[PDB]
Design a protein around this nucleic acid. Structure first.
Length: 97
RNA sequence: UUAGGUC
């Protein structure tokens, strides 16, 4: 994750929420399977605070919204060998967790 | 294994 960029497009709007992925799906496995319908400026999978392996979901931010759109058209998506569900990233203040 | 990596 983390890209040195001044995005005119909202990070949240360019970010895709990837939930229900493989436990083998890490950052490199995630972005590699998503960098196929665009450029990921910010790819990040959540790992367990204890095991440091996986949490079964992650995030992927493209270079622009139209690449997110392309990934959505690519449903059912496939990363690491797992069929996932890529949704528009909501505000973290929205969920407030 | 689905919301936050976010310091």
């Amino acid at each position: 994750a983390s890209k040195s960029e001044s995005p005119k497009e909202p990070e949240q709007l360019r970010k895709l929420f990837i939930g229900g992925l493989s436990f083998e799906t890490t950052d490199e496995s995630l972005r590699s399977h998503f960098e196929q319908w665009g450029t990921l400026t910010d790819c990040v999978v959540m790992r367990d605070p204890n095991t440091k392996r996986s949490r079964g979901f992650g995030f992927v931010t493209y270079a622009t919204v139209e690449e997110v759109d392309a990934a959505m058209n690519a449903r059912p998506h496939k990363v690491d060998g797992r069929v996932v569900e890529p949704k528009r990233a909501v505000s973290r203040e929205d969920s407030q967790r």
